[PDB]
């Protein structure tokens, strides 16, 4: 019901609501474009845009059996994904938005009730970037990293265990060895180590220790 589009221009709200009911009536290319655009600019939308993207994807399959919108969306994302490093340089905020959005898409947009394998390596590419020592020193990126691991970390591991394992080695490494990792960064990494080791769930006692 709530797709979280309040950040949008009033005209565009109408465009998006229209696409949900009658995809065929709107420019799905311009619709995917305004969604990716906004997703890189607003944090709440970046973590929630998957809902509306899924609704539209389903609406088009129902109405015309087409997957044009899915296709414009994936290809526009792939382009932002290819330019991830440049975007990170320009704005850490935009970059964490990109990662949150890609990962939200991986969570929401399925393909015959299965995850898109097209996004498995690109998500790991993103999380491995966050696990680097130049990224870990920024609580903003660590926050981003553990958000994705909380939300889709489990699904990701099923697709590829080898990558998850090597990723978490970087997390232990940063944890023990890095010195400009902050207190918050340390609390965030330690919680996620416990979180995975417990089978991607938060224990009652951990809940008490880490969170208000």
């Amino acid at each position: 019901e709530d797709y979280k589009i309040q950040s949008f221009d009033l005209e565009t709200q109408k465009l998006l609501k229209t696409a949900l009911k009658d995809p065929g009536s709107v420019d799905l290319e311009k619709v995917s474009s305004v969604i990716v655009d906004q997703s890189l600019k607003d944090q709440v939308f970046s973590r929630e845009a998957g809902r509306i993207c899924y609704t539209i994807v389903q609406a088009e399959a129902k109405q015309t059996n087409g997957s044009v919108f899915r296709r414009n969306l994936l290809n526009r994302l792939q382009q932002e994904f290819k330019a991830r490093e440049e975007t990170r340089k320009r704005s850490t905020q935009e970059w964490v938005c990109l990662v949150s959005f890609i990962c939200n898409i991986f969570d929401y947009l399925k393909v015959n009730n299965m995850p898109m394998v097209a996004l498995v390596h690109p998500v790991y590419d993103c999380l491995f970037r966050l696990a680097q020592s130049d990224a870990l020193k920024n609580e903003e990126e660590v926050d981003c990293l553990v958000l994705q691991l909380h939300r889709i970390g489990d699904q990701l591991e099923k697709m590829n265990v080898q990558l998850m394992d090597e990723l978490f080695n970087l997390l232990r490494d940063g944890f023990l060895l890095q010195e400009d990792l902050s207190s918050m960064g340390r609390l965030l990494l330690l919680e996620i180590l416990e979180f995975r080791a417990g089978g991607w769930k938060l224990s009652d006692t951990a809940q008490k220790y880490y969170y208000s």
Partner: peptide, 22 residues
């Protein structure tokens, strides 16, 4: 044709390739 840019890695394509393969 093999190696042509139509075959160059494309998320949209990979997903269709998966959807029909499943």
């Amino acid at each position: 044709p093999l190696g042509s840019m139509s075959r160059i890695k494309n998320w949209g394509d990979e997903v269709e390739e998966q959807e029909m393969r499943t």
